[PDB]
Amino acid sequence: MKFSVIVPTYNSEKYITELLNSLAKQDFPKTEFEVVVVDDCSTDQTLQIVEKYRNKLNLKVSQLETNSGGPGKPRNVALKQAEGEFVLFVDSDDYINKETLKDAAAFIDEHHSDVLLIKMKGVNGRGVPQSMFKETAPEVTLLNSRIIYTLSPTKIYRTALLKDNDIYFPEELKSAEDQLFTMKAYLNANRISVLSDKAYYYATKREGEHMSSAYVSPEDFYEVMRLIAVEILNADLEEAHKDQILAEFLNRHFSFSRTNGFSLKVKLEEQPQWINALGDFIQAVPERVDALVMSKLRPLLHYARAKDIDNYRTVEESYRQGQYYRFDIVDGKLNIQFNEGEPYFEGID
Ligand SMILES: CC(=O)N[C@H]1[C@@H](OP(=O)(O)OP(=O)(O)OC[C@H]2O[C@@H](n3ccc(=O)[nH]c3=O)[C@H](O)[C@@H]2O)O[C@H](CO)[C@@H](O)[C@@H]1O
Ligand SMILES: [Mn+2]
């Protein structure tokens, strides 16, 4: 067994066939890959739709007692059932290219990848990461490539890599359940590879609610962030490398996560809740890492670590308004003091 395609379902009857047709049309022998379907207690006709593909595909189907509250637990149940050499997570509302398992198998046989990224394509207006999919690369690291800018589970992982290092998704969590999982796989992979010859994984936009839009409390969200920083800092790598990996994670988190602009969008009466959870995550980042981060984020790291929402919000409002209490211009960049009696933050551009 080469691959295990792990499919978590939850009331997926309107789009599960578009998936199952792409596996049935794979030009890969159905005897060397399995479809591990774990249903998160669906109440529509998802399972009988799946049943019609029991002679078109090698299937392993099971259903949970109650809905787990997220994609994590179903994938965890499928992953310990998987006996394929490699694992591919495909969501119920997505589908893969006809040639995916053939090109992957051929690529991994040639380069012995532990994690293999496959190029993605957005369908029906859904955005998709692309900065790391412009060239097929046999070997990429966390620091010479943009792989940290895609933490979704929609990749090829070697089964032994996940099991030998005890890598699973957090359970009862609507979103952010993928970031810690994929980063742990990145942290332990002896070789990470990118495969961009075609458009392999098709991420769709349908209706209704996608899990990436479901509510996750700031406590649960930033606990995952805190766990990622802890995983980075205690990886079996050189200490300077771990600091730089953490800095690159923070650059991306503060630029593109819900943290970016929270004190401008969240209701005032809820922002202490955010600054306390965000601060528990930044308090796990040692202050030495602030120097490796993008300069504009250093005042935010500083006031997050101190749980100071007033100065944090003033920094965000100042960036948005382009107005500062005091600033100097040195070497085409700004050195800013955001409030009276506060420190100056230098090199901001
Ligand atoms: C970035 C990307 O390309 N895909 C991610 C995106 O998918 P997305 O935002 O589309 O969320 P989805 O609804 O597709 O959920 C992902 C998968 O989990 C299953 N599911 C959903 C709810 C539930 O209670 N039990 C269950 O098993 C879905 O059927 C689906 O197969 O946001 C999710 C939340 O982090 C991630 O898991 C997906 O990997
Ligand atoms: Mn989806």
CSV table of C-alpha atoms and ligand atoms in Angstrom, one decimal:
chain,number,residue,atom,x,y,z
A,1,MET,CA,0.0,0.0,0.0
A,2,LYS,CA,1.4,3.3,-1.2
A,3,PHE,CA,-1.1,6.0,-0.3
A,4,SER,CA,-4.0,6.5,2.1
A,5,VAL,CA,-6.4,9.3,1.0
A,6,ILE,CA,-7.9,10.5,4.3
A,7,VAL,CA,-11.3,12.0,3.9
A,8,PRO,CA,-13.3,13.5,6.8
A,9,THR,CA,-17.0,14.0,6.0
A,10,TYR,CA,-19.7,16.0,7.7
A,11,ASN,CA,-23.1,16.4,5.8
A,12,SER,CA,-21.2,16.4,2.5
A,13,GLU,CA,-23.9,15.0,0.2
A,14,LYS,CA,-24.0,18.1,-2.0
A,15,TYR,CA,-20.3,17.8,-3.0
A,16,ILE,CA,-18.9,14.4,-1.9
A,17,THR,CA,-19.4,12.9,-5.4
A,18,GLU,CA,-17.3,15.5,-7.1
A,19,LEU,CA,-14.5,14.3,-4.7
A,20,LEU,CA,-15.2,10.5,-5.1
A,21,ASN,CA,-15.2,10.8,-8.9
A,22,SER,CA,-11.7,12.3,-8.8
A,23,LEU,CA,-10.4,9.3,-6.9
A,24,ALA,CA,-12.3,6.9,-9.2
A,25,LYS,CA,-10.7,8.6,-12.2
A,26,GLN,CA,-7.1,8.4,-10.7
A,27,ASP,CA,-4.8,6.7,-13.2
A,28,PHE,CA,-3.2,5.0,-10.2
A,29,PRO,CA,-3.9,1.3,-9.4
A,30,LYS,CA,-6.8,1.2,-6.9
A,31,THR,CA,-5.0,-1.7,-5.3
A,32,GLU,CA,-2.1,0.4,-4.1
A,33,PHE,CA,-4.1,3.2,-2.5
A,34,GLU,CA,-7.0,3.3,-0.1
A,35,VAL,CA,-9.7,5.9,0.7
A,36,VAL,CA,-10.1,6.2,4.5
A,37,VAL,CA,-13.5,7.9,5.1
A,38,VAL,CA,-14.4,8.8,8.6
A,39,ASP,CA,-17.8,10.5,8.9
A,40,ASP,CA,-18.3,13.0,11.7
A,41,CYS,CA,-21.8,11.9,12.5
A,42,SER,CA,-23.6,13.1,9.4
A,43,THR,CA,-27.4,13.1,9.2
A,44,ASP,CA,-27.8,13.6,5.4
A,45,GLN,CA,-27.1,10.9,2.7
A,46,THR,CA,-23.3,11.2,2.7
A,47,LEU,CA,-22.6,7.6,3.6
A,48,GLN,CA,-24.9,6.0,1.0
A,49,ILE,CA,-23.3,8.2,-1.6
A,50,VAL,CA,-19.9,6.8,-0.5
A,51,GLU,CA,-21.3,3.3,-0.6
A,52,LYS,CA,-21.8,3.5,-4.3
A,53,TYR,CA,-18.0,3.7,-4.8
A,54,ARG,CA,-17.2,0.5,-2.8
A,55,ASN,CA,-16.3,-1.4,-6.0
A,56,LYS,CA,-14.7,1.6,-7.8
A,57,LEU,CA,-12.3,2.3,-4.9
A,58,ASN,CA,-10.6,0.5,-2.1
A,59,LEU,CA,-12.6,1.9,0.8
A,60,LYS,CA,-12.3,2.1,4.6
A,61,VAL,CA,-15.5,3.8,5.9
A,62,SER,CA,-16.5,4.4,9.5
A,63,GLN,CA,-18.8,6.9,11.4
A,64,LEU,CA,-18.5,8.5,14.8
A,65,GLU,CA,-21.1,8.6,17.5
A,66,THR,CA,-21.4,12.4,17.7
A,67,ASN,CA,-20.0,15.3,15.7
A,68,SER,CA,-16.5,16.0,17.0
A,69,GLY,CA,-16.8,19.8,16.4
A,70,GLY,CA,-14.1,20.0,13.7
A,71,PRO,CA,-12.0,18.2,11.1
A,72,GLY,CA,-9.4,17.1,13.6
A,73,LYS,CA,-10.8,14.0,15.3
A,74,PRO,CA,-12.1,12.3,12.0
A,75,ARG,CA,-8.6,12.7,10.5
A,76,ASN,CA,-7.1,11.3,13.7
A,77,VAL,CA,-9.4,8.3,13.5
A,78,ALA,CA,-8.5,7.7,9.8
A,79,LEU,CA,-4.8,8.2,10.3
A,80,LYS,CA,-4.4,5.4,12.9
A,81,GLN,CA,-6.4,3.2,10.5
A,82,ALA,CA,-4.2,4.0,7.6
A,83,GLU,CA,-1.6,1.4,6.5
A,84,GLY,CA,-0.4,3.1,3.3
A,85,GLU,CA,3.2,4.3,3.1
A,86,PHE,CA,2.1,7.9,2.5
A,87,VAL,CA,-1.0,9.9,3.5
A,88,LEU,CA,-3.0,12.5,1.5
A,89,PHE,CA,-5.6,14.6,3.3
A,90,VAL,CA,-8.4,15.6,0.9
A,91,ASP,CA,-11.5,17.4,2.2
A,92,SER,CA,-15.0,16.3,1.2
A,93,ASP,CA,-15.7,19.5,-0.7
A,94,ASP,CA,-12.5,19.3,-2.8
A,95,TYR,CA,-11.0,17.0,-5.5
A,96,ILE,CA,-7.6,16.2,-6.9
A,97,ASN,CA,-6.1,16.0,-10.4
A,98,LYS,CA,-6.3,12.7,-12.4
A,99,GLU,CA,-2.5,12.4,-12.3
A,100,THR,CA,-1.9,13.3,-8.6
A,101,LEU,CA,-1.0,9.9,-7.1
A,102,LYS,CA,1.0,8.9,-10.2
A,103,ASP,CA,3.2,12.0,-10.3
A,104,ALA,CA,3.5,12.0,-6.5
A,105,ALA,CA,4.5,8.3,-6.4
A,106,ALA,CA,7.0,8.9,-9.2
A,107,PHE,CA,8.3,12.0,-7.5
A,108,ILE,CA,8.7,10.5,-4.0
A,109,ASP,CA,10.3,7.4,-5.4
A,110,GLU,CA,13.0,9.6,-7.0
A,111,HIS,CA,13.6,12.0,-4.1
A,112,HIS,CA,12.4,10.2,-0.9
A,113,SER,CA,10.3,13.1,0.3
A,114,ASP,CA,8.9,13.0,3.9
A,115,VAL,CA,6.5,15.9,3.2
A,116,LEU,CA,5.5,16.7,-0.3
A,117,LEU,CA,3.6,19.9,-1.2
A,118,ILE,CA,1.4,19.7,-4.3
A,119,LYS,CA,0.3,22.7,-6.3
A,120,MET,CA,-3.2,24.0,-5.5
A,121,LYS,CA,-5.9,25.7,-7.6
A,122,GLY,CA,-8.7,27.8,-6.2
A,123,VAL,CA,-12.2,27.0,-7.6
A,124,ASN,CA,-15.2,29.3,-7.6
A,125,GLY,CA,-13.4,32.3,-6.2
A,126,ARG,CA,-11.7,30.6,-3.2
A,127,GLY,CA,-8.2,31.9,-2.5
A,128,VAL,CA,-5.2,29.6,-2.6
A,129,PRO,CA,-1.6,30.0,-1.5
A,130,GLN,CA,0.8,30.2,-4.5
A,131,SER,CA,4.1,31.8,-3.4
A,132,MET,CA,5.7,28.4,-2.8
A,133,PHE,CA,4.2,26.6,-5.8
A,134,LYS,CA,6.0,28.4,-8.7
A,135,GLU,CA,8.7,25.7,-9.1
A,136,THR,CA,9.0,22.0,-8.4
A,137,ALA,CA,11.8,21.6,-5.9
A,138,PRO,CA,13.3,18.3,-4.7
A,139,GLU,CA,14.4,19.9,-1.4
A,140,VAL,CA,13.1,23.0,0.5
A,141,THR,CA,13.6,24.1,4.1
A,142,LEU,CA,11.5,26.3,6.4
A,143,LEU,CA,13.9,29.2,5.9
A,144,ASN,CA,14.9,29.1,2.2
A,145,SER,CA,11.3,28.7,1.0
A,146,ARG,CA,7.7,29.9,1.7
A,147,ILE,CA,6.4,26.6,2.9
A,148,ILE,CA,5.6,28.2,6.2
A,149,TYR,CA,3.0,30.2,4.3
A,150,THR,CA,0.8,27.1,3.8
A,151,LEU,CA,-0.1,25.1,6.9
A,152,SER,CA,-3.2,23.3,5.5
A,153,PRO,CA,-3.3,19.5,5.7
A,154,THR,CA,-3.9,19.2,2.0
A,155,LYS,CA,-0.4,17.8,1.4
A,156,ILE,CA,1.4,14.4,1.2
A,157,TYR,CA,2.9,13.2,4.5
A,158,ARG,CA,4.7,10.0,5.1
A,159,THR,CA,2.7,7.8,7.5
A,160,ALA,CA,5.7,6.9,9.6
A,161,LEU,CA,6.7,10.5,10.0
A,162,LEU,CA,3.4,11.3,11.6
A,163,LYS,CA,3.1,8.2,13.7
A,164,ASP,CA,6.7,7.9,15.0
A,165,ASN,CA,6.6,11.5,16.2
A,166,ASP,CA,3.0,11.4,17.5
A,167,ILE,CA,1.6,14.0,15.2
A,168,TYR,CA,-2.2,14.6,15.2
A,169,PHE,CA,-4.7,17.3,14.8
A,170,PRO,CA,-6.3,19.1,17.8
A,171,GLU,CA,-9.9,17.8,18.3
A,172,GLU,CA,-13.0,19.9,19.0
A,173,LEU,CA,-11.7,22.9,17.0
A,174,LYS,CA,-13.4,24.3,14.0
A,175,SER,CA,-10.3,26.0,12.5
A,176,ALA,CA,-6.6,26.4,13.1
A,177,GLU,CA,-6.5,22.7,13.8
A,178,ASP,CA,-4.1,22.2,10.8
A,179,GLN,CA,-1.3,24.7,11.7
A,180,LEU,CA,0.2,22.8,14.6
A,181,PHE,CA,-0.1,19.5,12.7
A,182,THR,CA,1.7,20.6,9.5
A,183,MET,CA,4.4,22.6,11.4
A,184,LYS,CA,5.2,19.5,13.5
A,185,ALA,CA,5.5,17.5,10.3
A,186,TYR,CA,7.8,20.3,8.9
A,187,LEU,CA,9.8,20.3,12.1
A,188,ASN,CA,10.5,16.5,11.9
A,189,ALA,CA,10.7,16.0,8.1
A,190,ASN,CA,14.3,15.0,7.0
A,191,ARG,CA,13.3,16.2,3.5
A,192,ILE,CA,10.4,18.5,2.4
A,193,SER,CA,9.6,18.7,-1.3
A,194,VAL,CA,7.4,20.7,-3.6
A,195,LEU,CA,5.7,19.4,-6.7
A,196,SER,CA,4.2,21.9,-9.2
A,197,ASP,CA,4.1,20.2,-12.6
A,198,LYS,CA,0.3,20.5,-12.7
A,199,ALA,CA,-2.7,21.8,-10.7
A,200,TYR,CA,-3.2,18.9,-8.3
A,201,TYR,CA,-5.4,19.9,-5.3
A,202,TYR,CA,-8.6,21.8,-6.2
A,203,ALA,CA,-9.9,23.8,-3.2
A,204,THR,CA,-13.5,24.9,-3.7
A,205,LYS,CA,-15.9,27.5,-2.4
A,206,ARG,CA,-19.5,26.2,-1.9
A,207,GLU,CA,-22.4,26.8,0.6
A,208,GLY,CA,-23.0,26.9,3.4
A,209,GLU,CA,-20.5,27.3,6.2
A,210,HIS,CA,-16.9,26.4,5.7
A,211,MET,CA,-14.9,25.5,8.8
A,212,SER,CA,-12.4,28.3,8.1
A,213,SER,CA,-15.3,30.7,8.8
A,214,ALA,CA,-16.7,29.0,12.0
A,215,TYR,CA,-16.2,30.6,15.4
A,216,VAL,CA,-13.1,29.8,17.4
A,217,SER,CA,-12.7,31.5,20.7
A,218,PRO,CA,-9.5,33.6,21.1
A,219,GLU,CA,-8.5,31.3,24.0
A,220,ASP,CA,-8.6,28.2,21.8
A,221,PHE,CA,-7.1,30.0,18.9
A,222,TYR,CA,-4.1,31.4,20.7
A,223,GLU,CA,-3.5,28.3,22.7
A,224,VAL,CA,-2.7,26.6,19.3
A,225,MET,CA,-0.4,29.5,18.5
A,226,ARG,CA,1.3,29.1,21.9
A,227,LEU,CA,1.7,25.3,21.2
A,228,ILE,CA,3.3,26.1,17.8
A,229,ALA,CA,5.9,28.4,19.4
A,230,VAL,CA,6.6,25.8,22.0
A,231,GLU,CA,7.0,23.1,19.2
A,232,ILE,CA,9.4,25.4,17.3
A,233,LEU,CA,11.5,26.3,20.3
A,234,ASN,CA,12.0,22.7,21.5
A,235,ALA,CA,12.6,21.1,18.1
A,236,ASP,CA,15.8,19.2,17.6
A,237,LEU,CA,17.5,21.9,15.5
A,238,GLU,CA,20.2,24.5,16.1
A,239,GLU,CA,19.0,27.2,18.5
A,240,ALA,CA,19.5,30.1,16.1
A,241,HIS,CA,17.6,28.2,13.4
A,242,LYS,CA,14.6,27.7,15.7
A,243,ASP,CA,14.6,31.4,16.6
A,244,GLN,CA,14.5,32.3,12.9
A,245,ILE,CA,11.8,29.8,12.1
A,246,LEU,CA,9.7,31.2,15.0
A,247,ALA,CA,10.3,34.7,13.7
A,248,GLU,CA,9.1,33.7,10.2
A,249,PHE,CA,6.0,32.1,11.7
A,250,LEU,CA,5.2,35.4,13.6
A,251,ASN,CA,5.8,37.5,10.4
A,252,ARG,CA,3.2,35.4,8.7
A,253,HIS,CA,0.8,35.2,11.7
A,254,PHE,CA,0.8,38.9,12.4
A,255,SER,CA,0.4,39.8,8.7
A,256,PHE,CA,-2.3,37.4,7.6
A,257,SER,CA,-4.1,35.9,10.6
A,258,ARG,CA,-7.1,37.2,12.6
A,259,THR,CA,-4.5,38.9,14.8
A,260,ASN,CA,-3.8,41.5,12.1
A,261,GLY,CA,-6.0,44.5,12.9
A,262,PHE,CA,-8.0,42.8,15.8
A,263,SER,CA,-7.9,46.0,17.9
A,264,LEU,CA,-9.4,47.9,14.9
A,265,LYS,CA,-12.3,45.4,14.2
A,266,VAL,CA,-13.1,43.6,17.5
A,267,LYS,CA,-15.6,45.3,19.8
A,268,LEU,CA,-13.9,47.3,22.5
A,269,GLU,CA,-15.5,45.3,25.3
A,270,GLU,CA,-14.1,42.1,23.9
A,271,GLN,CA,-10.5,43.2,23.2
A,272,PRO,CA,-9.1,42.5,26.7
A,273,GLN,CA,-10.1,38.9,26.0
A,274,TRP,CA,-8.0,39.0,22.9
A,275,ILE,CA,-5.0,40.7,24.4
A,276,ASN,CA,-4.9,38.2,27.3
A,277,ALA,CA,-5.0,35.2,24.9
A,278,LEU,CA,-2.6,36.8,22.4
A,279,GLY,CA,-0.3,37.7,25.3
A,280,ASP,CA,-0.2,34.1,26.6
A,281,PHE,CA,1.0,33.1,23.2
A,282,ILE,CA,3.6,35.9,22.8
A,283,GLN,CA,4.8,35.3,26.4
A,284,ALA,CA,6.0,31.9,25.1
A,285,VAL,CA,8.2,33.8,22.5
A,286,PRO,CA,11.4,35.0,24.1
A,287,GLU,CA,12.1,38.7,23.6
A,288,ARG,CA,15.3,37.9,21.7
A,289,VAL,CA,13.1,36.7,18.8
A,290,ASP,CA,11.6,40.2,18.4
A,291,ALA,CA,14.8,41.4,16.6
A,292,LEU,CA,14.4,38.8,13.8
A,293,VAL,CA,10.8,39.8,13.1
A,294,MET,CA,9.6,42.5,10.6
A,295,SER,CA,10.3,45.8,12.3
A,296,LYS,CA,6.7,47.0,12.1
A,297,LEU,CA,5.6,44.0,14.2
A,298,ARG,CA,8.1,44.7,17.1
A,299,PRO,CA,5.9,47.2,18.9
A,300,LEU,CA,3.0,44.8,18.6
A,301,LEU,CA,5.0,41.9,20.1
A,302,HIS,CA,6.1,44.3,22.9
A,303,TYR,CA,2.6,45.4,23.9
A,304,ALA,CA,1.1,42.0,23.4
A,305,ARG,CA,3.7,40.5,25.7
A,306,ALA,CA,2.8,43.1,28.3
A,307,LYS,CA,-1.0,42.6,27.8
A,308,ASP,CA,-1.3,46.3,27.1
A,309,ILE,CA,-4.3,46.7,24.8
A,310,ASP,CA,-4.3,50.5,25.0
A,311,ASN,CA,-0.9,50.9,23.5
A,312,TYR,CA,-1.4,47.9,21.2
A,313,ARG,CA,-4.5,49.6,19.8
A,314,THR,CA,-2.7,52.9,19.5
A,315,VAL,CA,0.0,51.2,17.4
A,316,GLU,CA,-2.6,49.7,15.1
A,317,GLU,CA,-4.5,52.9,14.8
A,318,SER,CA,-1.3,54.8,14.1
A,319,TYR,CA,-0.2,52.4,11.3
A,320,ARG,CA,-3.7,52.7,9.8
A,321,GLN,CA,-3.9,56.5,10.1
A,322,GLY,CA,-0.2,57.1,9.3
A,323,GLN,CA,0.0,59.4,12.3
A,324,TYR,CA,2.4,59.0,15.2
A,325,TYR,CA,3.0,60.8,18.5
A,326,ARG,CA,6.7,61.2,17.5
A,327,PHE,CA,8.8,59.8,14.7
A,328,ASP,CA,12.2,60.2,13.1
A,329,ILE,CA,13.1,59.3,9.5
A,330,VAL,CA,16.5,57.6,9.4
A,331,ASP,CA,17.7,55.8,6.3
A,332,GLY,CA,14.3,56.0,4.6
A,333,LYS,CA,12.6,54.3,7.5
A,334,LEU,CA,10.7,55.4,10.5
A,335,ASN,CA,11.7,55.3,14.2
A,336,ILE,CA,8.4,55.7,16.0
A,337,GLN,CA,7.3,56.5,19.5
A,338,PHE,CA,3.5,55.7,19.7
A,339,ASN,CA,2.8,57.4,23.1
A,340,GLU,CA,4.4,59.7,25.6
A,341,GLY,CA,6.9,58.0,27.8
A,342,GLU,CA,7.0,54.8,25.7
A,343,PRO,CA,10.1,53.4,23.9
A,344,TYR,CA,11.1,54.2,20.3
A,345,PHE,CA,10.9,51.4,17.8
A,346,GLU,CA,13.4,51.7,15.0
A,347,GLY,CA,13.7,50.6,11.4
A,348,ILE,CA,10.0,50.5,10.6
A,349,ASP,CA,9.1,50.2,6.9
B,1,LIG,C1,-7.0,25.7,3.6
B,1,LIG,C2,-7.6,24.5,2.9
B,1,LIG,O1,-7.4,24.2,1.7
B,1,LIG,N1,-8.6,23.7,3.6
B,1,LIG,C3,-8.9,24.0,5.0
B,1,LIG,C4,-10.2,24.9,5.1
B,1,LIG,O2,-11.2,24.1,4.6
B,1,LIG,P1,-12.7,24.7,4.7
B,1,LIG,O3,-12.7,26.1,5.1
B,1,LIG,O4,-13.4,24.6,3.3
B,1,LIG,O5,-13.6,23.8,5.8
B,1,LIG,P2,-14.3,22.4,5.5
B,1,LIG,O6,-15.8,22.5,5.7
B,1,LIG,O7,-14.0,21.9,4.1
B,1,LIG,O8,-13.8,21.2,6.5
B,1,LIG,C5,-12.7,20.4,6.2
B,1,LIG,C6,-13.0,19.1,6.2
B,1,LIG,O9,-13.4,18.6,7.6
B,1,LIG,C7,-14.6,18.0,7.5
B,1,LIG,N2,-15.3,18.2,8.7
B,1,LIG,C8,-16.0,19.5,8.9
B,1,LIG,C9,-16.7,19.8,10.1
B,1,LIG,C10,-16.9,18.7,11.1
B,1,LIG,O10,-17.5,19.0,12.1
B,1,LIG,N3,-16.3,17.4,11.0
B,1,LIG,C11,-15.5,17.2,9.7
B,1,LIG,O11,-14.9,16.1,9.5
B,1,LIG,C12,-15.2,18.6,6.2
B,1,LIG,O12,-16.2,17.6,5.6
B,1,LIG,C13,-14.2,18.7,5.3
B,1,LIG,O13,-13.9,17.5,4.6
B,1,LIG,O14,-10.4,25.2,6.5
B,1,LIG,C14,-10.4,24.0,7.4
B,1,LIG,C15,-10.4,24.5,8.9
B,1,LIG,O15,-9.1,24.6,9.3
B,1,LIG,C16,-9.3,23.1,7.2
B,1,LIG,O16,-9.5,21.9,7.9
B,1,LIG,C17,-9.1,22.8,5.7
B,1,LIG,O17,-8.0,21.9,5.5
B,2,MN,MN,-13.1,22.7,2.1
